[PDB]
Design a protein around this nucleic acid. Sequence first.
RNA 1: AGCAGAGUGGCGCAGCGGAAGCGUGCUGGGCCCAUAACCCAGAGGUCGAUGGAUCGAAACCAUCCUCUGCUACCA
Lengths: 422, 109, 266
Amino acid sequence: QATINIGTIGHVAHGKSTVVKAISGVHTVRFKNELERNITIKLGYANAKIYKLDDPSCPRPECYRSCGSSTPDEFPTDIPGTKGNFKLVRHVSFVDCPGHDILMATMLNGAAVMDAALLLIAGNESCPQPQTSEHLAAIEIMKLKHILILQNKIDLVKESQAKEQYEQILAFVQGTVAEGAPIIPISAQLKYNIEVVCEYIVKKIPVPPRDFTSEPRLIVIRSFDVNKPGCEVDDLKGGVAGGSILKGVLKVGQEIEVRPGIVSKDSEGKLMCKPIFSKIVSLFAEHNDLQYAAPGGLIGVGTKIDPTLCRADRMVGQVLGAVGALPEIFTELEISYFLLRRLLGVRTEGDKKAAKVQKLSKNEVLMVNIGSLSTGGRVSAVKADLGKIVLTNPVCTEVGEKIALSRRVEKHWRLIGWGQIR
Amino acid sequence: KGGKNRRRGKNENESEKRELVFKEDGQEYAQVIKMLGNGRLEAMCFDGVKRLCHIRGKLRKKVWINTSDIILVGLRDYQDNKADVILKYNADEARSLKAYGELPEHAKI
Amino acid sequence: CRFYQHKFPEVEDVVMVNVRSIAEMGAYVSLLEYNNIEGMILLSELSRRRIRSINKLIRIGRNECVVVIRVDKEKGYIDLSKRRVSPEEAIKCEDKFTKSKTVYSILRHVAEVLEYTKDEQLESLFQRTAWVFDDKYKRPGYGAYDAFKHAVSDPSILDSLDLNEDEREVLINNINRRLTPQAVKIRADIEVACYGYEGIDAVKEALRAGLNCSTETMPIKINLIAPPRYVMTTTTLERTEGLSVLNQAMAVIKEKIEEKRGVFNV
RNA sequence: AGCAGAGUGGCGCAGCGGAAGCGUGCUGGGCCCAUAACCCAGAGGUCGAUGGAUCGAAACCAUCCUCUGCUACCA
């Protein structure tokens, strides 16, 4: 299954497929294939098995040696050991977030259900690069600090440039946790020092305490392509949710409720929403059958919903509770909030632009990323430490946790501040 | 032309074949670039310098110099930009000169 | 031999010919819309406009539609004209030309076995069989092909008048081989947008009831093209008997799914 | 993968139940003192496979495969 969710976030032009296939062995893929204008801009999924030969390096199935195929310029070979079967240490899960700035709201959502991260830095561009800081700050807000910085694209980048970049990032982030996070330079054109990464992810990132006894909550981020094959139609025996569970052991045959709900017919107001109920058909993770779905892992829960809800990616950031979950489904919400004194996620080579953003004004639409949900809503009252927001689609608030608040600076929204629900 | 008449009052002809000066001092081989009207015409020299070529008496309406092809050009004693056409060759003659290795081996026909 | 019910054409009728020579005064041509009798076309009555080329108009080895302007009944001079021709007449004549060819090929199998040492053999077969098939149904626009097509799908037509031997197998084979496979363009149009989870089994009950009052063992063709769209090609007759199968079945699927939760497309 | 088209005999488009169909091009001839326009003349040949009726099948009708067009998903 899975034990931890390590995320693979990283700004434009570092190469995703080479690094993702080295760590998991499962390609990051999605709609439009095709391939990728550059690096994956979709929310990729992948799981993997991490075993040892009693060595800090992680074998392949063929554990005698491993000859790469990253480049035919030279032969990159590494040796994990010699063969006689290897001991299974754990089953790991990844969360490949978008690597592009416009997709920030999606990157936030996907990130918010991980248990650790890997900041994929690229040495090609600017030293205190916008997105590195954006990522790091969001991570410390959500409730994580289990980060391993990875210098992923320094294959042709000289050692002065690459040294200056790690220095400037680590010096800018002087108020964000990063001093207890290692910085592992690797090759992505010769897959070198990959074996030492395997030592790091088992060290810096154990399994955090998971609450089995507590009531099941599944947070779905990705829909399912079911169905439409054959034989026997139409619509499906139904619809599969790619979600991570962050609380409770969800057992097979259990009934689960999707709690933001669907709005009642001919509503004259903003109420009333009614949750949808679906019975769990199957609990699939990796490529191995399971009867349970332990928390701390990203699992494909097939449920008895019908094709229309899964025919496109429409279940991004929905909260699912088993069953008749107590969590309130607000339509208008009381945010406590604070703002950054800089505009995060933007800063280029020349002061233009990135400074203090002006105070929020009422009746402006802002993206409130609450939980893994992403709703848009307008601010109806605006006091400094008390704003009232009215949301277009209702938000199930599992706990008052955190929020991330963004404002439409130009073409798309950009992160301005965070806070906590009251 | 396509036959016609009045084209015999005057000296048929032809090139009984024949042969073969060069270059001389300021008197060298060029290739037709364009094909202006009025009378004059363009022609880049084979050395690398461009120049604008000019027709010469007799050769006026007695010999047509279609576009593209080698041609013999005198250079004006003092003038750079404008130069003076001489003595054209034949396309066969030009490929024999190329095979000999006397003009530069760069232009195709 | 003759391809047509009458031996000689009438006046103002649309016919077909095949050019075998080109004349100075027009075109002398053989018929293949009747006997191989001679008919003369004239140069004046071919067009109402100029004529530069001449072999990019009429040439040898071409079927050309034309109108019989006059006929000498006794002499056998079939005067002809191409001046009055419309494309609608060409469609009507090409069909009759093609249909006579296939019908005479059916009435050639008969002559393969019987005494045909003389050319008049086919003429003997043609007059006695063809006329009673087509004359009864010429006034409604049918050829002898309609009579034979009716016989294969209900055999009483060719048993109502003298039935030949060995003919019947080849007759059946050629009718059933060429005029089939044989066909239903019945497709169901069904739209559904469920909020149900019991929809998967609900649809199964609805699918198997596409035709009411049939056995549980009825074979049908289910098709899934998209998630809301359920296409059922219902029981394949001719699409004039499965009309009730198409129409009322659509009501079943849309009704069965509304009972288990929410509103749907009607 | 649902629907559509095709699987050269110079080119390009692919026409129908009679073995190149249309448009075009190339090459040659004719007309003219000449050119254009105009008029004629061409060319080794199951046209992806497996079958049936047939005198015969790119073309009459099927069973398969592949490439593409539109729609669009399993992967």
